[PDB]
Amino acid sequence: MSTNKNVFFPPALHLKENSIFQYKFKNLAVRHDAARLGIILAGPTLFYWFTVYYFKGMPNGLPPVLLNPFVNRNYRGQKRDMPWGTDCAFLDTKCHEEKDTWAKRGPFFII
């Protein structure tokens, strides 16, 4: 009477394939999704490493960028107090070590 019967003991269905997988890969949408995956795997990925292998022992001769000149070393006298106290960029780990920046630790809890 309730549908719960088919929830408790659902019917078992017969396939002509060795598994649902194969049977489910006769739909053209799944085939096209697999084709897109294969396109990305075949073209770009195998080519990427190919280039990595082709230029393995050659230099990266791109000229460096020019950020801040010598006459503007003071940044026009602009305040440079980071929220963590010192004057170092967050991920400049080496520069932090020359300004501690981590001796001013707080407490584990409010006190």
Partner: protein, 165 residues
């Protein structure tokens, strides 16, 4: 098509909504009358009843005859002695037949979890209360956040950070 993009009939305004060819299927029909869009390439199998489970806490609510009428199978390998019954679309009654082989999906973890939510715990109107200690932790966290906010307001305004006293 804008209509089809926004889940409408499409170009033909008398058209239906479901396109099971690309995964847009009807869950209600599947649950009630089984996936009749797989009807051409699937067949029911016809010939261990369910009476062995007549004494369990949740299946004891059913009659003995009801469980006797149900025939089970291991659900992995095709029983070589079992005939095949054609699956007929437009027929709402074949999914409910008692002559077809079935599989006991009562040891599935989702089945157990559902029935435990209904038969294995004291009913609470609030799911958060269904877990007692987590609710304790959550109300404690609320009080902790209140205290933290009050202390931070006190410290920032008065200029003393409470660590020296």
């Amino acid at each position: 098509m804008l209509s089809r993009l926004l889940h409408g009939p499409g170009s033909d305004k008398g058209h239906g909504y479901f396109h099971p060819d690309h995964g847009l299927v009807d869950s209600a029909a599947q649950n009630i009358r089984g996936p009749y869009w797989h009807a051409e390439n699937m067949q029911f199998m016809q010939q261990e009843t369910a009476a062995q489970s007549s004494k369990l806490p949740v299946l004891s609510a059913q009659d003995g005859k009801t469980l006797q009428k149900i025939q089970l199978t291991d659900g992995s390998k095709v029983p070589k002695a079992a005939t095949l019954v054609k699956w007929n679309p437009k027929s709402v009654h074949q999914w409910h037949s008692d002559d077809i082989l079935r599989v006991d999906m009562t040891k599935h973890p989702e089945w157990v979890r559902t029935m435990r939510m209904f038969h294995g715990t004291v009913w609470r109107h609030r799911p958060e209360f269904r877990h007692p200690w987590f609710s304790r932790g959550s109300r404690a966290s609320g009080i902790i956040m209140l205290v933290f906010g009050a202390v931070a307001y006190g410290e920032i305004t008065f200029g003393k950070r409470l660590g020296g006293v």
